Symmetry: C4
Subunit: 387 residues, 4 copies
């Protein structure tokens, strides 16, 4: 049966640790894939950790990291949450150097984008087999979320970007059922930029907190309705949650346009709590180091900067990286609301470290009705490796 | 229940990437089988990659490649499509140095040929256990497809060759149900040669594009009816699709006899599109390098050379090799037609490279109603290995 | 359906060997986790071996053992009883440096405690996903059993300790259903100390033989009723079963308070046999070496020292360590009583051996209506390793 | 449901190759258990290869072979037929240095004998958990088949020997249901010796061809009725099938007592074909080298030496070893008779080779209504290994 992800996001006071793979520590001797983007998505039976692979293994010359991100080897694979992205427990998903995945209640739908920069192709898989395709409509590195997509009552939605990573790019919302594209939509967001959206279902709609890699230090936001009508802008919150970014004091929030002159960025996430918001972010305003998660009152609908809670998951002396959102299906939590959870990728090796390779580990957190103490569940690997 | 592979082959405009195992890159450090013929076949629940093993692992002295192809160690094993042919996720199938496999909807039937050259034996397995046998009827290296066989409404069919690899050999069509041979047939094809057939169901019949290793650069073709009556000849298309071969301009197609003086050959495939044809082939007319797939209008029924489409899957600067056909069951694609898919083996090491071993990787493609851009999803391993 | 662990513990005359993983011997070359506390718990379908991991593998520099027990890497994982705690067959359970687990008949519930010493958090998982939380109520290293918890008719119970490891600490009994805490209780035990309880269901109640790390060489005992009412004290038996401890002759048993001036201790277990008792213990009164299991008549209700049986499972020339209790569900043994079983962890490496690492192996035993001969099923690894 | 192994053994004209694991070749680089006795037994869903392990892996110092056969580490484990006895696909069965296993249609029952020589214990497991026990009744190395046991209509039978390996020993037949011993029997066989019986169901009775390690070169035979009544003696056949042994010409068969002065022996098997017999044996009369299988007309009931067929499975230039019988359940072969199959262990390393270890590989064969050509499916590993 299809999954009713119709409920509202549970109001949480903190986040308890879900899992930790320790993929890299384990990689010092085991057979682990050098990965990237260990995002999480759950089926009504289990949560899995998806990731990208170059077909290389840590401590092997193939992890030479000199291989382009968008290479002809990159593939999306997966394991159960917590297990390392090891070769022997891995499930193949799709050829891809950019992907997204979600379960609709019956089968897994995955979307692997591969091919050339000017004419890439995103293959949609359903039940472990390709079912539909999407060709680059703008001929400039077609890409997607790199985190869980969202299925609601049988139809799954996800956001895709095609165009430059600086100036205006083009953004679209896609909708499928059983691996078959049944609807799409162009997003008008002039002056705004959208990349690597972190979504989740909430009150029958799909909410996403994305990344503005053009000129915004605050995160773009777009609420998608099942008929592909939508709203889009920025996390109102008067606090910047991207990286790099400026100081909170020198930031005036905006629900409309991007604020801050910073241009780069990093994938992040955020959860609506009624009118409040849980927003994640690197602790360092300059580096992908540390990871904290703050709750701002009315931060979803107001240029508020009233911090109600601050929970540290990765101290600033440790590397972090991408982070994404996903939801615990009701059939797993046994709740009447959708438990909001997120994952935090922790990057090790190049460029901040002296190794010939680059990979990441992960730590997953989930809702919870209690305040959870600060701590650091960092990677832990001892670099460099035998190389 | 039995699988109704009664439908017609879907008319496709191009092929999207299905999977890539990167077995060899992974083999630099992981425990991977040195394989050969990573052909694909699907059950109504999943598609698997079958392959031959010498019981050796890449980067081990046993991959010494000096072992004869038809050795007493060669065995057929398998994994899910996309996973590498690694020891720990592998399923044993049958003792064999030549094989074929297909699922009828309930269980997997596999056919492993092993034993001596002058008195080989092909063991038929059903549900993971031997059920019937076929002894060399011509006493000269009994062999079969090396790619998926074909089941239609409970009965599975496959082609077998016994006799020299040059002059006339003898060819037969076999038919079984539940691993039990219930019918066979001698193929009259004087002057013609048949090897490593790549088949697939189409309109209730079994179509196969094979290999003429005697004197034809164009591929032999035989349509099998469920009562073992048949038609046989060559892909009409006025373009040669074997390797080696001559230039397209110096080739006059023929649906009847072989054209071209070339004698060797390589396993290939082809898909009927009404009257048109999708024919695969190495890009190089001399080497097993590169891989393209051309669509010729009326090429299935006419000595046509009207190229409607050309899609490159492996550029000519990269090694290729065998390639085979298979179909996506309806119960997986959710289609009303049989999605045509093929696999392309990519050989690395001896003889074209300086290593003491020889193995291959693979990339799988499937139907799709859209034009797919050219690109190259090549092996990627860095040779030589620690040896 | 829920598991009726309502029956009485079977009266056993000895213990037959259940399984042996040989994790460490295997670790000399395979990919095995450096573990700790390989406790066992069973579902109505199978028994699994749970354990703690630092994300390190034997013979790797990460097994450097210098990492704190309560590190941010420690995680609870598991495999089927007898299999080694190898990376490739492991199932992730929860982030933890102290844990407990039991199955209620439908799903697995696990409890991982992690976080900082003064504000640790114990995450309760149900069906492979976090469902509830317990925060340190006494702000001093919250911890639990390190052995199987106990489910009876749908509700699962376990004991937790928060406070110093010397002087008085605080002890609580928790009760959950479907991963949700539905009841708890404070244990009044002034002068008494409770740690690492080894429990099991018996006559509809939960019996536990724990560890007094403050001043008792005899083991504390507490019988929990389903309404969280309880009784607590010490194994009446006139023989000390902790380590370190004094000689049996210089020991006067007590069902009330601790006897013996010794302060440290080690996790142990014990089984009620009507009024008799099976109590395990290191053979050495000073070291965690050897392992024997004695049956004392009326030792559960009387300060008796009448040894009816003595069975050696690990000779005194071999290292032992922790040991815990668990029960064979009725649906597996086919019995009408709950077969009492225990596991014996065998520690190798630091501090008693010269290696840079420390890990353990295990051997599991179960009830049985017959006397079983003495023998030694010790670890067996040859130290040191390549390091 | 229970398995009706009531049918007769199929009349076969030869044996087709079922599987080959190549465990040792694979072990040169992969993680494989140094094993012994890779016997096969099938459930109504699959056939598995069981084996003994020292917890050691090939190419590791623990495979030092100096460890006693009956050590405290030896354990029975298993994988699916054809897969190598690798650590990562292995299933733990029972602590044992001698074992037997069979499936009754519902669950797997296994019997692991372990413990000391003068007081060994055989633990019976059912459904992956210990259910009953058998203690040495004669106090001198209790042991069993080392090959598949036999279940018929719910009750499983197996033979056990306790006593010296030379002079008279004591032999018993055991009968269980659901892992519970429900009947046993003493075998009167004065002057006769029984070891490592290879059994199989035939016409509602259990037939076994065993090993006389005292004074017979011909194999002892005992037909067990479901009520534990029985018949016992020797394979009538006028040809010796043990190793060592004398020449066929200098042998006068006997259905009664042992013939030949030779004393040692090796585990073998044999299949009744009405009145005829298929008997296996090393080709060399002196060494465990080569393996052939001869069919003697009326050899089961007459001192006949009329060889109807001779099929070689392992040439005399290659090492062999133990061999055992098992049957293909009807629910797998789809036959109306029980397909007779056997396995041939191939030993490599000490004592015949210069390595510090000793292990074996295997090749499985099954019934088949056709004559199968001679060939050799030998081990294949290249010795010595990195050591
Ligand atoms: C340890 C190692 O192999 N590092 C190599 C480095 O030597 C080389 O210059 C570079 C460019 O190909 O690739 C990797 O960085
Ligand atoms: C690296 C290696 O072992 N190569 C060997 C080569 O030395 C040898 O001459 C040949 C013939 O046996 O087999 C392999 O090619
Ligand atoms: C073999 C090895 O790496 N041992 C190291 C030792 O050298 C070092 O002094 C200590 C402190 O960091 O950690 C480990 O004991
Ligand atoms: C290569 C190796 O470690 N072989 C050892 C040998 O040196 C030793 O004398 C013997 C007795 O312990 O055991 C093994 O045979
Ligand atoms: Ca930015
Ligand atoms: Ca040719
Ligand atoms: Ca103590
Ligand atoms: Ca003998």
């Amino acid at each position: 049966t299809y999954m009713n992800n119709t409920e509202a996001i549970c109001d949480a006071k903190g986040f308890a640790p879900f899992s930790k793979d320790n993929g890299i520590r384990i990689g010092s001797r085991g057979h682990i894939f050098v990965i990237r983007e260990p995002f999480v998505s759950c089926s009504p039976i289990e949560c899995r950790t998806f990731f990208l692979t170059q077909g290389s293994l840590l401590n092997d010359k193939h992890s030479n990291g000199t291989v382009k991100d968008r290479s002809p080897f990159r593939t999306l694979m997966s394991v159960e949450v917590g297990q390392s992205p090891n070769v022997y427990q891995a499930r193949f998903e799709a050829v891809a150097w950019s992907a997204t995945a979600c379960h609709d209640g019956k089968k897994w739908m995955t979307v692997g984008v591969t091919g050339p920069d000017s004419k890439a192709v995103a293959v949609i898989h359903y039940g472990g087999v390709p079912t539909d395709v999407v060709n680059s409509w703008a001929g400039d590195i077609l890409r997607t979320q790199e985190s869980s997509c969202t299925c609601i009552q049988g139809d799954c939605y996800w956001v895709m970007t095609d165009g430059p990573a600086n100036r205006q790019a083009q953004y679209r919302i896609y909708k499928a059922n059983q691996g078959r594209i049944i609807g799409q939509t162009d997003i008008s967001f002039n002056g705004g930029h959208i990349e690597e959206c972190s979504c989740y279902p909430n009150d029958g709609k799909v909410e996403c907190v994305c990344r503005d890699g053009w000129t915004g230090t605050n995160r773009p936001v777009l609420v998608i309705s099942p008929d592909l009508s939508y709203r889009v802008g920025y996390l109102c919150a008067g606090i910047p949650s991207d990286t790099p970014r400026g100081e909170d004091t020198q930031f005036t929030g905006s629900c409309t346009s991007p604020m801050g002159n910073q241009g780069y960025g990093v994938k992040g996430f955020g959860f609506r709590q009624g009118t409040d918001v849980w927003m994640g972010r690197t602790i360092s305003r300059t580096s992908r180091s540390g990871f904290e998660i703050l709750r701002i009152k009315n931060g979803w609908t107001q240029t508020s900067k009233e911090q109600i809670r601050k929970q540290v998951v990765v101290d600033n002396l440790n590397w972090s990286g991408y982070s994404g959102s996903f939801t615990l299906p009701v059939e797993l939590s046994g709740k009447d609301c959708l438990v909001p959870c997120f994952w935090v990728e922790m990057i090790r090796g190049k460029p901040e470290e002296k190794t010939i390779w680059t990979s990441s580990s992960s730590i997953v957190m989930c809702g919870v009705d209690y305040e959870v103490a600060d701590w650091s569940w960092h990677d832990g690997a001892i670099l460099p490796f035998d190389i």
